[model samples]
Structures are given as C-alpha cells and as structure tokens.
Target chain A: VSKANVPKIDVSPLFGDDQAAKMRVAQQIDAASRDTGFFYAVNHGINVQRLSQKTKEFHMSITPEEKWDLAIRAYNKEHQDQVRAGYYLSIPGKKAVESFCYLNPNFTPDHPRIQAKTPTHEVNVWPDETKHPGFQDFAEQYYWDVFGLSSALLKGYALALGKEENFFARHFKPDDTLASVVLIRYPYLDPYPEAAIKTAADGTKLSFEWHEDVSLITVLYQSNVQNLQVETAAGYQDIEADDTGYLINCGSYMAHLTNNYYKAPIHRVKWVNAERQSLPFFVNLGYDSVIDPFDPREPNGKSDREPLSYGDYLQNGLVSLINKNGQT
Target chain B: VSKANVPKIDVSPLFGDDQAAKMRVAQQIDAASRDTGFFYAVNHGINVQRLSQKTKEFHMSITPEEKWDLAIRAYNKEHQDQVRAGYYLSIPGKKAVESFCYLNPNFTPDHPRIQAKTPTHEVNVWPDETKHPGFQDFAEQYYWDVFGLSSALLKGYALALGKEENFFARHFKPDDTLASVVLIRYPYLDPYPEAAIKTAADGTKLSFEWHEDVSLITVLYQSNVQNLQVETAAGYQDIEADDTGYLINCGSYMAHLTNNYYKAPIHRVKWVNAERQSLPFFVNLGYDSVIDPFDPREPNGKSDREPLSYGDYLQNGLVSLINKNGQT
Candidate 1:
C-alpha cells in the first residue's frame, strides 16, 4: 500500500485516571497500528503550540548566511564540525542543503551503560554555544520533553497489544541508552535556474529519499512548511502538520516485536521553494533489551530472526546510513 | 540545451554623443538579438533597483488572501468591461494566480487617438483603491517608468537596425498606439500536496506554460523572487534578475519587421515555493502601422505573410489567449 491512511488517535485519556477513556484511545491506536503502522497523536498533554513557537524562535535566530559561518567553524577553528558524526553540513551534493545536531540520552560516552555496551552511537556534537546562544539548552529541553511524551505513547502501544501498560517500560533501567534526538534545519530554497533543477535517470529530483526509521518508533514534529509524503496503500500521499497532533510511525524494532503486526511505513521529504525544519526523536529500547516476537500466531509465525540487543541493532543501522551519506 | 547565456548589452552609449560607443552597444545588441532573440540590457540609464524596490513594496502590501479577494471582485461592480478586452479574471483555472491592470498611451478608451482607432483597448481595472492605499499610484508610477524605458530601448533597436535613431518616432503620432503596460501580481506559492505539484505529461509542473509574447517587443522586469525559464538553443535555462538589468525579448512583430534578424524566444514560469511578481511592458508601433519586412537580406526576405494592422495583430492574439483561458 502506498498511501497510508494514518488515523488521528486522541491519546488525551492516557493523562487521565479514566480507564474507559484510556481503553477507547487504545482501540483507536491499535486499529491505526494494524493498518498503517503510523498514526496522529493528539492531546498528548504537551503544549504543541508553545513547542512550535519556541522552536521557531530558535531557528529564526540564525539566518542562512549565519548558518554558513556556524557550519564552517572547525575544532582547530571552533569550525562548526562538518565532520561525519555529530554536526553535519551536506550542501555540496544537491541531496539536501541542511545541518543537524545529534543527541543521545543514555549513551553519553562516560555513562556506565555505554561503557559496557559494544561501541554504541556517538553523543552530541553541537555547534558553538557562543555563536548560537541558548541553542544547546533549547535542544536538550525539547529532547527531554519529547522523550517523556514518546514513553507515555509507548505504554498505550503496549496496552493495545493486550500486554501490561509497562511491558515496554522494563527495557529501560537507570539509563535507557539507545534513543537519540535529531533536529534538522533545511535552509530556504534559493532561486536556481531551470537547468540547475534537473532530474536523475530514475525521474527523481534532488530531495531526500524514502526510508523507514531503524529504531523502535519515531516521533516527528514538523514546522509549518509542507512537502513530506508517506507511502500507504494508495501511493506516496502528502502529509501536513495537523494543528492538533504529532506524527508517530512504528519502526523496524516495533515490527520485529509484534512479529510484523505493524508494518514500518515508508516516507520522504521534497520541499520545493520553502524552508523546512523538522524534529524527529528516535525512541529506542535500552542497549540490552532483546527484541523477540511477542505473538508467534501473528504474521511471521515462528520467529526465525535472531534475538539481538536494541543497541547492536541501532548501531548496525546508524553506521550504514552515516557511512552511506558519508557523514557521522 | 538547458542553459541560456543571455548577453548583457550596454546601452549607456545611446544616451551620449559618442557615436563610436553607440555603435559598440549596437554590435553587442545585434549579436545577442541574432543569436537568441533575447539579452540582458544594462546601463539603460534607469534606477532599476529603485523601480524594483517600489514595485516590491506595492506587491508586498497585500497578503495572498487579500489578493484572492481582489481577484474575485465582481466585474459588474468593476463593470470593468472585459468583453474580449481588459480586466480579466481567471480564478477557476490554474494557469496563473495574478491580477493585472492594463493601460496604453493611445488606448485609454477616452483618449482622442484611441477613438481614432477601432476601439483599441481599455484602461486599468483596479480593485477598491480605498482598501489598498497608494497601490493605484504605485502601479501607475511604475507602469509609466517602464513604458518610457521600453520606448528608450526601442530607439536603440532602430539604431542597431541601421535606421535613423527616431525611425519609430513617426509611428507614434500625438500618442503612440499599441504600447501598453501590464502590472502582474503573482501571489505567493501556496502550500499544496505533492499531488497538486505533480508534473504534466510533458514533465512540466504547475506554473505558466511555455509560450511567446505577441507584440513588437516585450520588456520584462521581475521582482526578487525567481523561476522564470527561457528556451535557449541549449534547452530551458533559468533566468534570474541580475543587478543592473532588465530582460528584453523580441515578439513576432519585431521578428516580422526585422525579417527574422531577431527570433521570438519562448519562455515559461515554474515557481516552486516562492512568490513572484513581474511587470511586462508590451512595446508596439501605431495601430495602423503594417508589419512588413524591413531588411530583405535577412531570413524573411520578400515576406509573403499578409500585411495586417498592428491593432489587429494585438487584438487577435490577446483575445485568443484570454478566451482560451476562459477569462476576459
């Protein structure tokens, strides 16, 4: 299916004590999950408007010209590290003209859990705090809040599966070491001549390609700019940021756990002349959580896939993508 | 070929007593004119930036919503008389999102010279001036300036063609007929889905279709935004406003008169996600002037095309386009 008819499931009841209301939310989520592996999450007890306003202010603080300054600053020069892992600037290749900062909660290098793990992902590689003052704090605060929100949403997912509300929560101990935050900034589309905006042999122009997240689940927050499409039963249908919700899509891990009960939906971005900024928090399980089929009766009956730590799974995927993009 | 390297002919000599410098400008003009029918005209002795700045202010004064309201205003209320003539509204069709106010030196309708002709053309059909203060004044001022610029440029063409500098001066008795101004307002590219921005069978997207203008010569002044492509020997190359210049393209009439010394170049607009506003001043000779071969040595030697009055040519082409678009 190409066009995913993702449902808007009101998860407002999760914040309330009403089990009946919670069950209703659970049913809506389960239905959407079974159908598209993606759904709209609304009334999740977060002030979305406030979040948008704060993020917009942060993004507006730096112009495109200023960003070039930030992107070029290196360690020898406080040059915004364009080096592959943490701070990346991919402009030369028309694949995209963007910059992003990466952050992980439990794998902060010195953390004990990260010490025991087999070379997990790298921690945050931020730009100069002096140039973009308060950016680090803003990113960290937003990341922590969204992490909590995703945790609450995951409980509802567990409930929909007829398991204990905290079934997925046990994966994280003192330090749940695999999840990360990626705040992407897509600069304003400049006026280029028609010849410069040509297509490739596959009939695709210069834009991000379609792919599913490698984590357990991915939570997305998009700005006002449009041009993101999701592949569903129909085809790649356009998705816009709805006033009342954030988009949640089940990733490979989630599909692995449910034995393919949830299909990882494909999506891509192709913003034309508009500047787009998006926040995607990859919600992963702890490094030691063994992913296994919860119900063999479901699709992929007897799980033939080998059990692996979520961190290892995440490490393998992240390395491939970062290496493929020739970035960190 | 998708790149058009349009020459920037320096026309500053035309304003001086230096006949040698004037001949240098003429040679450059003839070179570009003969090769591609279009050229970037600089040193034309006009404050292009000031003109652009004023027009930008006028265009920026209104939001996309307000322009839609202005576009949908009743002609009965406007009683604007768009019967195969002026004050056209084409909202239902997606050919363009713009509003134009037309005016001509000879065809002001009430002008005596306009009466002498076969009811040539009507004046501007602006929306409520009270709502948009200074808009009327701004449009008129910019229109007047561009009309003069086109006139000055036309004289350079005469000198380039080895004719007396004021050769076309005789064509405009009292008030030159067929010359007019069209101030077009292309609203911001609204946020639409990927499907809405899909390409046609020919792989072109949602913007102006490719076509040539109908006039002696067309002078175009674009705003800060981009996405104007001209078909060159290489293909459709994008053309953006360079500092200190306006775009000049020969129309069929200019081609006819020059006996194809200059060809009418094809162009189109494919605005991605930017708001573009442009002013096209259609420069023409008197309504009674017969379009005929001027230089027999050129490609169109002994022109076999039927001789038609300038007004007939203008009226026929304008009426056909407006009618085809289901407007006027």
Candidate 2:
C-alpha cells in the first residue's frame, strides 16, 4: 500500500564507530543536503564493483524497451503508494509566497501506490530478475544502500539539531517505511541557459518557482546539465555538484517539523532533460510516530517532550495525507 | 515607504575580468544561498587589522554594561527611525520563538512580535558610542563596511545568477536608502558542556529565522567567536569563520523572485555571548521599492513585472514577506 512517504532506515550503527567517521559523514551529508536531496549510493555496503559491472552490462543489454519498462514500474510505485497530502504539519500557513501547493494529481499512471495500510508489494516490477541475471542482486543491494544513506541522513539531522543520534531514531525505532529513487534522465536546456528571468504575481511574467524537498532529507548527484536552484537572500541560485560532496535538500516533512526554522524551500528539478541520474534516499519517519521539533529552546540537549506522534501532524491537517489511511 | 526590490544582480561582468575570482565568488555566493545563507567576507573594504585590534582591545575596554548600552541605543535608533519593527522583528504572539523575542520587549515593550522572531538581541549588543571609547568610529565604519559588502553581495548575486554585474544597477544605482547594521559580539561559550540547549520559540537558539529581509539582503560579518550555525536539511549546522572570508546569508525575497531555484532560509546569529561582535547588515533596496521575484515565464532579456513591495509583505505578514517577494 502507498503511504505519504517511503520507509526510514536508521544507519547510526554503521557509522557509530567514532567521531571522525561521523564527522566525515556529516560533512558530506551537509553538502548534499544543501544542494540536492538526491544522490547515489557507493560503498554503502553495496558491491560497488559489482554494481558498476551490472550498470555497464545493463547499458549494453538493456534496450530502450527495458529502460522504459523499469521507468514505468518505478512510477507506479510512487503514485499508487502515496497517502493523501498533509499527513503532518506544525503550522497551517508556511512560506506563502512560494504559493506552495500539493501535487493535484492522484498519481502518475505508472506510479505504484497503496490506498491504505501501506500496500506491501509481493514483488517489485523490477527488471527481469532471471533474464537479467545479477540485475536482481544489484537491485537488492541498491535498495539497502539507499536505505542506509537515508538512515545516515536522519542521524545527521539529529546531530545538527544538537540531539543524540537516536534523537529521531528512538521514535522511529523498528523502522517501518519504504522509499524510492526517481533516477531521472532529463535533457539539457540550451547553453543549458545558466540563468533565466521572470516576474512576480500581480500579472508579472516571472520564469521560476523555488523550494526544497518534502522528505526528511534528500540527496542529489547530478551530471553537468545545470538548472538546479534553491532560494537564498540574493535570489534563485544554482547548486554545483562537481565534487564528492553530495548536495542536500530539505523536504516538506522536515520543514514543517522544524517550525520552518530549518525549512524546506520551494524548488523545481529542471526538466531540461539533461540526462542525469540520481538515487533519492527519501527518509520518512513512521506514519504514526510523533516527533517534536528540535527544541530550539534547548540548543544543547534533546527536548523533554515526547517525540511528537506523527499522527499529531497528520491529524492537525498539516500533513495532507489523502484518504486518511488509504492510498491512491 | 518601501518600494520594489532592486533589479536582480548578475555576475557576468565580475567573472569576465577574472575567471578564478569569478568562480570563487560565485561558489561562495552559492554556498551562502543554499546552505548557511551566511558566509564570511575577506576582500571587504573593512580594515582587517583594525577589526582585529578592536576585537583584542574589547576584552579590556568594552564592559558588559557598555555593550548593553550600545545595544539599547541601537535598539532605540532602530525603533525611532522605523515605522516597521526595523532591524528587530515584532513578535506579536506571546509564545514567540525567535531567539531575540525576549529582547523584542526591551526594544519596544509595546510591540511584541511573532514567536518566530526571538533572541531579540542575543549577539554582541554594541556598546553605546558615548559610553565606549572609539565606539562611534567602530560602529560607523562597521555599518559602512556592511553597506559595501552588501552592495557587493547584491551584485554578486546577480552575477551568480548568470547575468551581468550591472544587471540590477539601474534599479538600485548608488544604494540610496536607509540601510543599517545590527552589530553584536559573541564571546566563547565556556564549559563547552558538550551539547547546549536553547529555549522554545527562541530565534537566537535557532541562529536566525526563515524570513527574508525587507532590505535587498542581510550581510553578517563576524569578528570573533564560533557557535555560528546555519540551517540546513539536517538542521542548524555550524558555519566556520576564517579570517579570510566574510559570511553572507540569503533572504526569502530572493527565493520568491527566483522561483524554487534560489531559496532564502531561516537563520539566526548564534554563538555564546562572551565577547565577539558581528555586523549584520540589513541591506534595503529603497523605502518604496518592492522585490519582483524573478519569474521564469517571462522571455529572457526583458523584465515584465512590477517590483516586490516591502509594504505588501509587511501587511500580508512575515510569512508572506518570506514567501512572496523574496529572491528565493
């Protein structure tokens, strides 16, 4: 069944060895968090060598039809799995100027979703497991890798908030969630047009709309296509992804939980069709878990309040989860 | 008396002269816009030697009381000169969350602000000029320094957006407006009690808020002290202050104008209040100017909308101010 979010994976244990490892992870996480909330997984326990071999082979063996098949199947998962919008929110109105609104579509036709109770797919519409040979293994590895990254992201969130690694993990313990990577392949837009201009409302013909992501945290890795931007004091600015440092982006849930203090801005993926692929490790907390904001009050310690029940945000109408408990 | 924000700044000209410098500034600007929205400035006209001297001497000459006096005077100047809340946001709700909200009452006991604006004056409250020797020169030079830095910031913003440095010059010209800077000093937080916590609805604990400045932008220059953090997907993360660079932050107005491309994050001035100072430049466009968020729909080479109005943002509320006219 589709839920408003994917599952959350806790990765504190993996990087819990010491401060240095954690610090490195934090650095990368922060970079990725700021630039794009989407990226790929490498040594995240995945046999990178094998995955790379598989990708190369996939490229050679997988025809256009195979790619399309995978694309359609992936779409189905996201669309069908979504719960109604606004499952959780701390405040009613947020940055209004973004004219931020929920996606109006029920789900893209290919999206796999659940109407209620989080539909559990007996099998993924993945590439032909048998015919593709090791593809299935690689896919499995990819799954965990993405999850690990997401868990790492959650830990990073906690650390940033001046809380323990489990600050968020405790409530989300028994991690029950699922997530997917869109792996988009967009085209380039001219010079790819490094910049464009537009106007505001009141009959103004502006060209852009800015915002952050909706997941707890998002990681993005991109090719040289250009056009990824975030809101700043100066104005719409571009994010560079030319280094090992992954770009990070704020999602709706994170923004709402933080009382907009640590906000998820308005943004758009340039449909420039620039031919870039990224794995999004969407970290979704339990649908029922209650989580409170990092008490801005206690900049030093964790808040005394119980981790807010996820339902509080959902019930309050902040989380716009469609069908309450059902799916598309 | 505010009007539309100055035209968007462009970076093409700056880069045209020096590729390395162009890229350097562009990347730095990108960092401020996407992550911390706060960065350090180096090439600023401010005398680094003098600034360092002041920091060193303050330990001896500037008393806590003197700093408080400066803070009080500045607060008074801000209110007396402003029809709006001035540099300080007016938190109306009793449970104001801003770090400086506690100080808002001190600024204008009559006009409490939204919880979002807190800490009301947590940083190095300047020492009154009359009480602290050389205070006038320091404050004036600091203000002018911020003015120049912000001037460069706006220009840099335009350039970073992939346009000419002079793009916004027509609208802003020679910076004729009532711009001001909030000077604060932060001392080292002793007893580095591992993790420190802040109060609820506290803006200071947060570093800054999510709203954009009424002015074109807000530029903060740090003298001494760590604990300076910026909001990210993870949360409020620390920002390093190198003697070589100046910190800059993006505001909401930029995000709106740029669409979801550029974002204005909620931030604050964070650090243990010991004996450090920061000049946060509240860079304004003009009393009657508005910020026309850059729209992507308008054809390139032509601006087709009225500017974003600061007046409208104030009336609509801070949320609207951030969401609507910001460059984000």
Best by DockQ: 2
Q: Give per-residue CA lDDT, model 2, range B113-230, as digits (tens).
A: 2222322122223344565578556655555555555666666777666666755433443323434444333334444322333432324443233444544566655554664544
Give candidate 1 misplaced runs (Cα > 4 Å).
A1-328, B60-80, B83-96, B105-110, B113-117, B127-129, B172-174, B193-202, B296-301, B324-328
Docking class of 2: incorrect
lDDT of 1 by residue, A199-318 (tens): 422344435656667878888877776656775544456665675678898887776677566767766666465666677777877767885655535352444233557765665455
B-chain TM-score for every candidate: 0.81, 0.59
- For model 2 chain B, where is the 10-residue window of minimal lDDT? B96-105
**DockQ of model 1, rounded to 2 decimals:** 0.01
Error of model 1, residue A130, in angstroms? 99
